[PDB]
């Protein structure tokens, strides 16, 4: 298609089959389809653990730096991937979500202790 | 490098031009001798024909 307006972006293009997702990191005009025309492939992401239990990310860090230097935006999942790698700082919401999960498990642990204490009262009743 | 190769080309053309003049000179000498002999036959035949 003949796009008018838009910018280059670095995003994940979904491949694979049903229940078997696989991603291609690509640089593409933002108005293009998710799996359609791209400019360059900048790596790949396999989100399923392999035989060794490792999720495999490939990053062409030379070309990624080239396209960020030319104005390429980043999708939020790709900003998270660069943070885990260490190439970018950890994303604000990666830290916030980790804090929310910590606060949510603290409640669960406290409730289990309260239930155990309530169960202890049942033990006292016999 | 371009200028050097374009100079070498002109030298090759002059070297080949020198050979051409040497060869053509030899032909003029030989053809001149043949022409003189042929003109003699014409003189003999022309006188006889007259």
């Amino acid at each position: 298609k003949a796009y008018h307006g838009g910018h280059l972006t670095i995003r994940l293009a979904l491949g694979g089959c049903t229940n078997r997702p696989f991603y291609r990191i690509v640089a593409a005009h933002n108005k293009c389809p998710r799996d359609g025309r791209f400019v360059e492939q900048l790596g790949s992401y396999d989100p399923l653990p392999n035989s060794h239990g490792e999720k495999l990310v490939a990053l062409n860090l030379d070309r990624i730096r080239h396209w960020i230097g030319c104005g390429a935006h980043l999708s939020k999942p790709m900003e998270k991937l660069l943070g885990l790698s260490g190439f970018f700082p950890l994303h604000p919401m990666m830290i916030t979500n980790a804090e929310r999960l910590r606060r949510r498990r603290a409640r669960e642990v406290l409730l289990a202790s309260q239930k155990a204490e309530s169960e202890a009262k049942e033990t006292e009743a016999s | 490098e371009h200028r050097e190769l374009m100079a070498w080309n002109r030298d090759e053309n002059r070297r080949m031009q020198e050979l051409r003049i040497a060869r053509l000179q030899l032909e003029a000498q030989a053809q001149e001798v043949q022409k003189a002999e042929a003109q003699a036959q014409r003189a003999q035949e022309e006188q006889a024909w007259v």
């Binding site: 491949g15 694979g16 696989f22 492939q41 399923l48 392999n50 060794h52 | 371009h2 374009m6």
Partner: protein, 170 residues
């Protein structure tokens, strides 16, 4: 039997044997040769055998040939700067003519190798995609990675159909 004389000239292998790749300056190569004579035999053989190979490697160069216009055969190259390189090929074998033009106006082996490598810069083996452009279409092809569900059924717990059933059960 392939028609014509020396039908090997009409094979891609023969056309690719040419080694004269002109510099970007070369734009036109006029060939003046004589069809009759003894000192122009190499020029006639150069038109017969070599001109196809030169055109094959230099598709954008205009090769125009004129016959029996001058006493002797010669080659005149027209460059983009406006320079005109005259070559005299009388009494010269066709092999000699090719070597001469290769030296004066032919790209060197080093330059051609650099261009080939630069052409392939954007092909990466790790890249995934169609066979025309990439070695592997999907990461399932790689050894140790989760295989394609089409070839090998996935475990039930890794399936959305199964996960949805448990959520309903919850």
């Amino acid at each position: 039997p392939m028609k014509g004389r020396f039908p090997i000239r009409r094979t891609l292998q023969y056309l690719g044997r040419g080694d004269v790749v002109f510099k970007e300056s070369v734009k036109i190569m006029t060939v003046n040769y004589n069809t009759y004579g003894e000192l122009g035999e190499g020029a006639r053989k150069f038109v017969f055998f070599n001109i196809p190979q030169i055109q094959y490697k230099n598709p954008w160069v205009q090769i125009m040939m004129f016959k029996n216009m001058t006493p002797s055969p010669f080659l005149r190259f027209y460059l983009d700067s406006g320079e005109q390189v005259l070559v005299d090929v009388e009494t010269k074998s066709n092999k000699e003519i090719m070597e001469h033009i290769k030296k004066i106006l032919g790209k060197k082996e080093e330059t051609l190798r650099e261009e080939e490598l630069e052409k392939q810069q954007r092909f990466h083996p790790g890249n995934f995609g169609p066979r025309k452009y990439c070695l592997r279409e999907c990461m399932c092809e790689v050894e140790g990675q989760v295989p394609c569900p089409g070839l090998v059924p996935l475990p039930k717990e890794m399936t959305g159909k199964y996960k949805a059933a448990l959520k309903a059960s919850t």
